RNA sequence: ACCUCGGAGCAGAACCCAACCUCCGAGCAGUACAUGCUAAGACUUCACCAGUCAAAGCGAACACUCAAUUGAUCCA
RNA sequence: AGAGUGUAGCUUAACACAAAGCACCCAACUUACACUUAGGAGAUUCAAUUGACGCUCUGA
């Protein structure tokens, strides 16, 4: 009993009478490469994936490359394996070109889009700089994926973006204690005249991040939206409860997302203070519990089982005396 | 009469430790969350559902004879083997409130 | 107190939550084949006749961060994109990208000859001095 | 051609293990774990138990 | 043995010269092989 | 000549099953010296006795290869 | 003189963040080859979808 294949069977196309004439892999790497190519390709049989799933610009760049290739000193250094590339410069001009798409990839991986906009994706075109000032000299940056302690995020951060109205919103997606889907609002500055952020209307006062102890890592996202024309908007936790999806839906017409910057935070000492005097509540504490270990149904006669078998099914290790 | 074979077919719930298949030779290769014993027997590393799939076979580079076979294949050729997987059914754990401090 | 209203079971939707707590599952099987799937994150390096690319990829196959000589950012300061110093520059820049992405731990799984190569050794050195460990913490059961 | 011999440790005394040795070879000195001192210590051959 | 000339020390400008020669040679041989390929195809 | 163990004809495809016969082989060996300790869950030569695999953990390091290569109780 | 046209050898690679991926050559190991390592050279025929410079077939 045989059933014909439901599609092209692999290795069928290359199957020839003459095999000596055909070129072969001579290296492990060549086969490997072709293997990943096949793995990524869709298949009619059951797979692992199923179950576990400008002209002027070009000319200018070419000219620059030619000029860079012209020098002898750089070539010498390259040969000597001493040549270095400045990280500051490359970062600066990377943020301009290939920045937004990489940020999009990060946001996609962290699943911000699915939680915020219910699957909808946007490219964070405008560069956004958020920094939490610590002391009078130091400042902790907020990149995409960075981890910042709530102690450092106690005060409102400095927001700078080189652009010419705007709005910004900081949201904690997993911060919510009651409703899993819902998020906590932190601070929503609306109608921001250009780069200058101080002039903006304070819809909601700043509240520092409060991830509960033993609740794991919490992600907080700053979302910057471009505003076409002015529009009217609108310590208790209930008031802070919001969904970004609904808010954006109702403000879709006059307001579109432009920038994204997200950081991570664990519980810290400052969170206790946030809970105590600011929220005027007892601090919730969580712990990671695992499901109870599986044991098969106890038998009257455990055969060829060690003595310790019985200890698997007893609740208390202290001795019992029954009626006596 | 060694009684070797598949013990758990596709769609069967397994617990960690459960022996999926005894084989003598590598008929079924270990896939996701499936351990392999000394005797070449396959066992579940996780509690879940057993799946059988066809996956592209890339041997370890140190495995001399397999690499030799690979390097003798034509340019379009890829090798496939049967693989046993366990799709885990339960999450690692949950966070629950213990103290309203 | 309406503030003192908490769910009995806390829900955290962060994809990186359990990984950072080191309680997330890794794919422990695949012993017969190469490479291992037992990682949360992987450094994967593609060597081409014209370009070198280094990638940080999750187990699920989603890409996190990348350093490619194909990009103008790295091109503009490189004499040639196919050498040891190209790899070293890619190493340093990827380390910077990883730090800002918050990824501190990944595994690198080379072929023996690739490991023996000085270029990849210097890439690994760039990883180390970059602040990225090329060994992942063992998960907690 | 092989003999089973007893190996006794210099430290953590009273612990010994049996190992097989080529008959024509010299007396074995090994470095083996001792549970009494909870560390790897030197062991010497005392006598041949049997011939296998 | 190798007591004939154990010492082998050269300058830096000669290394630069060598590198340039090898680069030029690579280009030249590529061009020559191209000529060969063209003529055989023809 | 044979009596125990492993392989093929030999169940064409889960397991098991071809008595008698026709052939082959085994009764070792080599490398370690954590070939330490402990412990979920399982397999099993159709019983039992035997036999097999193994997560996690403690302690180390940065549960060997081989188809069989074997022997209960008593007793010394 | 007409027709067919057009990316380094190849590719209905190029939505874009980009001229990409295999081919090719030199040096080391190899008697060699192959692998690996270490380096090198490479292109959208020109001007505004259109017109004319290169290529192949048809006239003497
Ligand atoms: Mg039985
Ligand atoms: Mg029988
Ligand atoms: Mg273990």
PDB file of C-alpha atoms in Angstrom, chain D:
ATOM      1  CA  UNK D   1      45.986 -11.015  31.349  1.00  0.00           C
ATOM      2  CA  UNK D   2      44.230  -8.648  33.778  1.00  0.00           C
ATOM      3  CA  UNK D   3      44.023  -8.851  37.580  1.00  0.00           C
ATOM      4  CA  UNK D   4      41.615  -7.241  40.043  1.00  0.00           C
ATOM      5  CA  UNK D   5      43.523  -5.296  42.707  1.00  0.00           C
ATOM      6  CA  UNK D   6      42.552  -3.249  45.779  1.00  0.00           C
ATOM      7  CA  UNK D   7      43.427   0.460  45.876  1.00  0.00           C
ATOM      8  CA  UNK D   8      43.760   2.051  49.334  1.00  0.00           C
ATOM      9  CA  UNK D   9      43.993   5.824  49.880  1.00  0.00           C
ATOM     10  CA  UNK D  10      46.811   7.492  51.829  1.00  0.00           C
ATOM     11  CA  UNK D  11      44.312   9.961  53.333  1.00  0.00           C
ATOM     12  CA  UNK D  12      40.722   9.458  54.546  1.00  0.00           C
ATOM     13  CA  UNK D  13      41.890   6.027  55.666  1.00  0.00           C
ATOM     14  CA  UNK D  14      39.562   3.020  55.589  1.00  0.00           C
ATOM     15  CA  UNK D  15      38.265   3.755  52.081  1.00  0.00           C
ATOM     16  CA  UNK D  16      39.310   1.578  49.139  1.00  0.00           C
ATOM     17  CA  UNK D  17      38.118   0.657  45.635  1.00  0.00           C
ATOM     18  CA  UNK D  18      38.819  -2.242  43.258  1.00  0.00           C
ATOM     19  CA  UNK D  19      40.229  -1.734  39.752  1.00  0.00           C
ATOM     20  CA  UNK D  20      41.534  -3.996  36.979  1.00  0.00           C
ATOM     21  CA  UNK D  21      45.215  -3.842  35.999  1.00  0.00           C
ATOM     22  CA  UNK D  22      47.494  -5.515  33.442  1.00  0.00           C
ATOM     23  CA  UNK D  23      49.289  -8.334  35.279  1.00  0.00           C
ATOM     24  CA  UNK D  24      52.702  -7.651  33.709  1.00  0.00           C
ATOM     25  CA  UNK D  25      52.521  -3.909  34.501  1.00  0.00           C
ATOM     26  CA  UNK D  26      53.881  -2.276  37.675  1.00  0.00           C
ATOM     27  CA  UNK D  27      51.883  -1.396  40.817  1.00  0.00           C
ATOM     28  CA  UNK D  28      49.219   1.250  40.161  1.00  0.00           C
ATOM     29  CA  UNK D  29      49.218   4.622  41.858  1.00  0.00           C
ATOM     30  CA  UNK D  30      46.011   6.533  41.115  1.00  0.00           C
ATOM     31  CA  UNK D  31      44.358   9.818  42.049  1.00  0.00           C
ATOM     32  CA  UNK D  32      40.761   8.976  42.973  1.00  0.00           C
ATOM     33  CA  UNK D  33      37.934  10.660  44.901  1.00  0.00           C
ATOM     34  CA  UNK D  34      37.611   9.886  48.606  1.00  0.00           C
ATOM     35  CA  UNK D  35      34.142  10.539  50.159  1.00  0.00           C
ATOM     36  CA  UNK D  36      35.469  10.524  53.746  1.00  0.00           C
ATOM     37  CA  UNK D  37      37.652  13.595  53.093  1.00  0.00           C
ATOM     38  CA  UNK D  38      35.320  14.698  50.248  1.00  0.00           C
ATOM     39  CA  UNK D  39      38.252  15.281  47.858  1.00  0.00           C
ATOM     40  CA  UNK D  40      40.505  13.572  45.299  1.00  0.00           C
ATOM     41  CA  UNK D  41      43.468  11.898  47.020  1.00  0.00           C
ATOM     42  CA  UNK D  42      46.257   9.475  46.064  1.00  0.00           C
ATOM     43  CA  UNK D  43      45.587   5.720  46.200  1.00  0.00           C
ATOM     44  CA  UNK D  44      48.122   2.868  46.191  1.00  0.00           C
ATOM     45  CA  UNK D  45      47.754  -0.840  45.376  1.00  0.00           C
ATOM     46  CA  UNK D  46      48.104  -3.122  48.407  1.00  0.00           C
ATOM     47  CA  UNK D  47      47.374  -6.634  47.086  1.00  0.00           C
ATOM     48  CA  UNK D  48      45.811  -8.521  44.165  1.00  0.00           C
ATOM     49  CA  UNK D  49      42.287  -9.742  44.952  1.00  0.00           C
ATOM     50  CA  UNK D  50      41.860 -12.076  41.947  1.00  0.00           C
ATOM     51  CA  UNK D  51      42.841 -12.751  38.319  1.00  0.00           C
ATOM     52  CA  UNK D  52      40.199 -12.111  35.642  1.00  0.00           C
TER      53      UNK D  52
END
